[PDB]
């Protein structure tokens, strides 16, 4: 077996490299240090970190959002520190419970939620600028930023775009561990079972495919690490036996194959499509479809099944039944 694919047997140390960027080389703070146990399964060097304007703006806005959330959470346990740790998972900051439409809600019923939403959104935009500009500063393409953009766009969809399209802030995602989980069922119940939303299906198809692709790609590179397949950039520009064997393994298995470069386009595309499909689904939901199951029945797609115990009429529609 190739033990190098499991962990680094003999680690190496050397002077720390610094690639210069078009700006901000002085905003790298911290002194690098080395972790021997990290170095078994990764690169041993931790830090320094770049510390630009957008990154600080992100930390500023983020912490503001975190603080607004934590304070409202603590209010929910009347500031008892012990119950706060006990009940942490169950605590939350909720959008309005009452229907104000799109009017700004009272602070006690969703205003603080809206506030925390604003500052998180600013934090996401600020970090996006960091992710984008750091690439151009180092003379790299902006591929990560465009993937990250789709992920931010999906959050905005469930956070505020879908609420504004249907016209009620009551539909946003709460802040908190269990409560953001509870939203998923409330939403799916409201809109007629999300299994029958084709864009749920698409998103899941791509999410599962990301698991398929990264398991397959990761396994492939490790299987050709003896020929240096991990040095992917120079295998793109000068095809070595590593990527020839990787390409032929797949070709002989499934009948076709990618290149060392194109496999990353596949992976990038699949990842992006998780978020793009999710967003189309949310954008259609509530605006143009009210019950995804009935929409599938309307178009003849839903499965049906025999009764097992007897079919049961809606009692509310029998004559003389109470309301």
């Amino acid at each position: 077996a190739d033990y190098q694919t499991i962990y680094t047997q003999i680690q190496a140390r050397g002077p720390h490299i610094t690639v210069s960027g078009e700006w901000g080389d002085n905003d790298r703070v911290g002194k690098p240090f080395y972790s021997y146990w990290l170095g078994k399964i990764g690169d041993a060097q931790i830090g320094p970190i770049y510390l630009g304007a957008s990154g600080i703006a992100a930390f500023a806005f983020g912490s503001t959002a975190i603080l607004i959330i934590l304070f409202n959470m603590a209010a929910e346990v009347h500031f008892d520190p012990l119950q706060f740790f006990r009940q942490f998972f169950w605590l939350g900051l909720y959008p309005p419970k009452a229907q104000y439409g799109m009017g700004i809600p009272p602070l006690h019923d969703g205003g603080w939620w809206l506030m925390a939403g604003l500052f998180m959104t600013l934090s996401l935009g600020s970090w996006w600028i960091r992710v984008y500009s750091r690439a151009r500063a180092l003379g790299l393409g902006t591929h990560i930023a465009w993937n990250f953009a789709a992920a931010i766009f999906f959050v905005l969809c469930i956070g505020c775009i879908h609420p504004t399209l249907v016209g009620s802030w009551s539909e946003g995602v709460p802040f908190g561990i269990w409560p953001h989980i509870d939203w998923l069922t409330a939403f799916s119940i409201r809109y007629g079972n999300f299994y029958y939303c084709p864009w749920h299906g698409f998103s899941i198809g791509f999410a599962y495919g990301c698991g398929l692709l990264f398991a397959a790609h990761g396994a492939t590179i490790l299987a050709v690490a003896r020929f240096g397949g991990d040095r992917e950039i120079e295998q793109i520009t000068d095809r070595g036996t590593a990527v020839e064997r990787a390409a032929l393994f797949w070709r002989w298995t499934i009948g076709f194959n990618a290149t060392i470069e194109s496999v990353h386009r596949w992976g990038w595309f699949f990842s992006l499509m998780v978020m793009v499909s999710a967003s189309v689904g949310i954008l259609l939901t509530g605006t143009f479809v009210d019950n995804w199951y009935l929409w599938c029945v309307k178009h003849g797609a839903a499965p049906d099944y025999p009764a097992y115990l007897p079919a049961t009429p809606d009692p509310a529609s029998l004559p003389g039944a109470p309301k």
């Binding site: 929910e76 346990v77 008892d80 119950q83 006990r86 009940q87 998972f89 169950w90 605590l91 939350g92 959008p95 309005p96 419970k97 009452a98 229907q99 439409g101 799109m102 249907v166 016209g167 009620s168 009551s170 539909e171 908190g176 561990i177 269990w178 409560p179 989980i181 509870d182 409330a186 939403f187 119940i189 409201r190 007629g192 079972n193 299994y195 509530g286 143009f288 479809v289 009210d290 019950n291 199951y293 009935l294 929409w295 029945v297 839903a302 049906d304 099944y305 025999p306 009764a307 097992y308 115990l309 007897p310 079919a311 049961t312 009429p313 809606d314 009692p315 509310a316 109470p322 309301k323």
Partner: protein
């Protein structure tokens, strides 16, 4: 952390749909033994003599019974409601027609309520019916009642923690969670849905596309109604010791016909019956109760699904005393 196998499972939908009950035998046995404490029927007595309307002085509900029949009732009532306290719980030792103790007047209304249940709500209690025991289980205060705010523990026979106490505000989220099967849902399904008939449980649209005029802005129900319905369903499931598939094919929670079991219809009647009981029999009794029975808003204790069911899909696993005590209903 975990419950050792095997599990008992049942089937409630077409094969391949994963519908049905999942039960831990130990737990079922412990509930079976708790419920087997149901006292057996007192021996039948011969109907003899005049109606007790002519014999006793203050008999307004049970007036058509004979003396032995009526005293048999009174023995059964004491066994079901106040066995440890005895007949003197409701009566003055020296004047059995005195209404001076509040349990007397309450018991009279409870008699009317119980026969109402067995006569007007057969759509829910069928031929099984209820007795005083179904709720009370041998104590004057039933172990599973609800106030207009959640209380812990669920069984009022256990002693509350400082945090469990309703006046400790830091314990509200936990009081609420334990009523909704430990979910973080931020809604009290009892005051929302079971205390009165003001709210609609259904939230799911019955059309594929959104209907213009109910689908935008303030025309829309807030999403919180869906959280609230879900919370009601968590609470209902936990109260019967069962899961959603007992009543629903989760393919379409809102559909009836093949998508619902007959138990879902019975449950629907149960919601209406509990509303009738609370609005018309139990909530008015804050006039007749001491202040130590009332909640922080002067409300009487009221009933939910757990009051009768106590964690079993049929109260007391289907035990019945209807044929043994005709005077409790149904009434022609």
């Amino acid at each position: 952390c975990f419950e050792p196998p095997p599990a008992t499972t049942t089937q409630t939908g077409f094969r391949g749909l994963s519908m049905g009950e999942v039960l831990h035998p130990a737990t079922v046995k412990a509930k079976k033994e708790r419920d087997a404490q149901y006292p057996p029927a007192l021996a039948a007595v011969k109907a003899e003599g005049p109606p007790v309307s002519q014999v006793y002085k203050n008999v307004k509900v049970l007036g058509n019974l004979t003396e032995a029949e009526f005293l048999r009732t009174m023995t059964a009532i004491t066994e079901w409601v106040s066995p440890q306290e005895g007949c003197t719980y409701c009566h003055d030792e020296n004047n059995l027609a005195s209404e001076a103790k509040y349990p007397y007047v309450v018991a009279r209304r409870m008699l009317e309520m119980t026969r109402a249940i067995n006569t007007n709500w057969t759509q829910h209690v069928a031929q099984t019916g209820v007795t005083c025991y179904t709720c009370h289980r041998g104590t004057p205060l039933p172990p599973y009642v609800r106030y207009l705010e959640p209380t812990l523990p669920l069984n009022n026979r256990e002693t509350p923690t400082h945090v469990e106490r309703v006046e400790t505000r830091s314990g509200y989220v936990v009081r609420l969670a334990k009523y909704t099967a430990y979910s973080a849902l931020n809604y009290d399904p009892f005051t929302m849905f079971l205390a009165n008939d003001k709210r609609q449980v259904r939230v799911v649209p019955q059309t594929a596309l959104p209907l213009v005029g109910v689908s935008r802005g303030k025309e829309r129900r807030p999403l919180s109604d869906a959280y609230a319905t879900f919370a009601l369903m968590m609470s209902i499931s936990d109260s019967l010791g069962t899961n959603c598939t007992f009543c629903h094919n989760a393919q379409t929670f809102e559909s009836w016909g093949k998508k619902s079991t007959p138990q879902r219809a019975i449950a629907w009647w149960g919601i209406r019956m509990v509303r009738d009981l609370n609005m018309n029999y139990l909530a008015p009794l804050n006039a007749s109760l001491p202040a130590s029975r009332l909640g922080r808003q002067g409300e009487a204790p009221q009933a939910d699904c757990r009051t009768c069911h106590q964690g079993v899909t049929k109260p007391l696993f289907g035990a019945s005393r209807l044929k043994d005590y005709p005077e409790l209903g149904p009434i022609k």
